[PDB]
Design an enzyme around this catalytic site. Structure first.
Site, short mmCIF file in Angstrom:
data_model
loop_
_atom_site.label_atom_id
_atom_site.label_comp_id
_atom_site.label_asym_id
_atom_site.label_seq_id
_atom_site.Cartn_x
_atom_site.Cartn_y
_atom_site.Cartn_z
N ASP A 1 -35.50 -24.53 -25.09
CA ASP A 1 -36.84 -24.48 -24.51
C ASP A 1 -37.11 -25.57 -23.46
O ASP A 1 -37.46 -26.71 -23.79
CB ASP A 1 -37.89 -24.53 -25.62
N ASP B 1 -39.32 -22.33 -17.30
CA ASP B 1 -39.44 -22.33 -18.75
C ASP B 1 -38.58 -21.27 -19.44
O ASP B 1 -38.93 -20.09 -19.45
CB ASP B 1 -40.92 -22.15 -19.14
C1 LIG Z 1 -43.15 -24.29 -27.78
C2 LIG Z 1 -43.29 -22.93 -27.10
C3 LIG Z 1 -42.68 -21.82 -27.95
C4 LIG Z 1 -41.83 -20.87 -27.38
C5 LIG Z 1 -41.27 -19.83 -28.13
N1 LIG Z 1 -40.45 -18.99 -27.45
C6 LIG Z 1 -39.97 -17.78 -27.80
O1 LIG Z 1 -40.09 -17.27 -28.90
C7 LIG Z 1 -39.21 -17.04 -26.74
C8 LIG Z 1 -39.08 -15.64 -26.77
C9 LIG Z 1 -38.36 -15.03 -25.74
C10 LIG Z 1 -37.79 -15.82 -24.72
CL1 LIG Z 1 -36.83 -15.10 -23.38
C11 LIG Z 1 -37.95 -17.20 -24.74
N2 LIG Z 1 -38.64 -17.76 -25.74
C12 LIG Z 1 -41.54 -19.72 -29.50
C13 LIG Z 1 -42.38 -20.63 -30.14
C14 LIG Z 1 -42.97 -21.67 -29.41
F1 LIG Z 1 -43.78 -22.53 -30.04
C15 LIG Z 1 -44.80 -22.63 -26.92
C16 LIG Z 1 -45.07 -21.40 -26.05
S1 LIG Z 1 -44.24 -21.60 -24.50
C17 LIG Z 1 -42.91 -22.60 -24.69
N3 LIG Z 1 -42.17 -22.91 -23.62
N4 LIG Z 1 -42.58 -23.08 -25.82
#
Ligand SMILES: C[C@@]1(c2cc(NC(=O)c3ccc(Cl)cn3)ccc2F)CCSC(N)=N1
Ligand code: NA
EC number: 3.4.23.46
Length: 381
Positions: A37, A223
């Site tokens: 992430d 991101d």
């Molecule tokens: C910390 C946070 C986050 C991201 C996720 N991501 C996913 O589940 C996911 C899904 C598909 C893809 Cl391609 C990429 N990622 C899941 C839980 C989270 F707390 C908060 C929301 S924004 C961000 N950049 N990080």
């Protein structure tokens, strides 16, 4: 430098669930799958037997665990997690041959955080200290890695995409086999998120003709932890209007463009060519110089396989409105090899050797272009 065979193909995932890497925490080492992430700054792992989890950090089994005797509460727009801060020895099996003492948030309560059916148990926040919870004193993992080893202050991501996705996280280097053509670099505006400046937007080569401040209202970020290309509301509004016009051969319900419903076609009969390319011009390294990245419908129309009420090939429109600025998520990153060049405060983009395309169009990174007043495209206040 240049080739890192052991790190190639070290990322896995499922569509819509993100990209995870194998990590070990504690002594003896406990294997966990950890979401990659670039949009956050915490290393936070499940530490309790939540029913969605394959496995979790058991601090009692680790001799090298140290308690920081401090809690952390992290609410998001939708969902939360809560944990207990500590340190332990952290290693990456298919990464550099090192072991690091890193901050770990041991997750003890959460809501809408872990995904039911997913194969990851924690999150590797790769962004900067400024947005770490609870505050900037909690050193992010990659900062700890660089401080404690001779690993260069750089990593790169090749996210491959479309049921199992794959990719590479090259820690401390660039692998030239992962991209074609040349890398083009955009300055990291500020080290908090991986913040960048978008200076121009085209749909099928047609400029959106907006004040470039709108493209970065209130920020633009890269991101890996977000699926969508997320655009500020006013930019989204105008982009969809132009995408609607460009794709007039077939008509679709309004709800599809808002991601309120899917659109399905018969298998293999998907009309990519009726959908336009999307171009983002990014601030270049040089005064008045820019470059352009270009994605295909293959990137912004995501296959949804989980539909049971339908037997066809259904897609979600993965460009969406935002109130947090532009988010260059997987929709962008899957077209490109992305170099997070932390040492030089810049992000490189090159055409991905693995990106999905047809025989008529490919994703592209092109330059140089002449763009004036690029500094005025950034948001202040
Ligand atoms: C910390 C946070 C986050 C991201 C996720 N991501 C996913 O589940 C996911 C899904 C598909 C893809 Cl391609 C990429 N990622 C899941 C839980 C989270 F707390 C908060 C929301 S924004 C961000 N950049 N990080
Ligand atoms: Na969430």
């Amino acid at each position: 430098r240049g080739s890192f065979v052991e790190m190639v193909d070290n990322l896995r995932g499922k569509s819509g669930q993100g990209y995870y890497v194998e990590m070990t925490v504690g002594s003896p080492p406990q294997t966990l799958n950890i979401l990659v992430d670039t949009g956050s700054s915490n290393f936070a792992v499940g530490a309790a037997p939540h029913p969605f989890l394959h496995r979790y950090y058991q601090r009692q089994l680790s001799s090298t665990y140290r308690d920081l005797r401090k809690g952390v509460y992290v609410p998001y727009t939708q969902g939360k997690w809560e944990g207990e801060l500590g340190t332990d020895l952290v290693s990456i099996p298919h990464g550099p041959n090192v072991t690091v003492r890193a901050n770990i948030a041991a997750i003890t309560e959460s809501d809408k955080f872990f995904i039911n059916g997913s194969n990851w148990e924690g999150i590797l926040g790769l962004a900067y200290a400024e947005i770490a919870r609870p505050d900037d004193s909690l050193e992010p993992f990659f900062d700890s890695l660089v401080k404690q080893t001779h690993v260069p202050n750089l990593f790169s991501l090749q996210l491959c995409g479309a049921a199992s996705v794959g990719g590479s996280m090259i820690i401390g280097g660039i692998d030239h086999s992962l991209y074609t053509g040349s890398l083009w670099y955009t300055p990291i505006r500020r080290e908090w998120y991986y913040e960048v400046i978008i200076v121009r937007v085209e749909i099928n080569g047609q400029d959106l003709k907006m004040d470039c401040k709108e493209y970065n209202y209130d920020k633009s970020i890269v991101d890996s932890g977000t699926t969508n290309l997320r655009l500020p509301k006013k930019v989204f509004e105008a982009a969809v209007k132009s995408i609607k016009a460009a794709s007039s051969t077939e008509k679709f319900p309004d709800g599809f463009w808002l991601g309120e419903q899917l659109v399905c076609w018969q298998a293999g009969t998907t009309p990519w060519n009726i959908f336009p390319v999307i171009s983002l011009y990014l601030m270049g390294e040089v005064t008045n110089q820019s470059f352009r990245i270009t994605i295909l419908p293959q990137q912004y129309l995501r296959p949804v396989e989980d539909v049971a009420t339908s037997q066809d090939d259904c897609y979600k429109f993965a460009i969406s409105q935002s109130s947090t600025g532009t988010v260059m998520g997987a929709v962008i990153m899957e077209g490109f090899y992305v170099v997070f060049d932390r040492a030089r405060k810049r992000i490189g983009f090159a055409v991905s050797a693995c990106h999905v395309h047809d025989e008529f169009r490919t994703a592209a990174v092109e330059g140089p272009f002449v763009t004036l007043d690029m500094e005025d495209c950034g948001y202040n206040i």
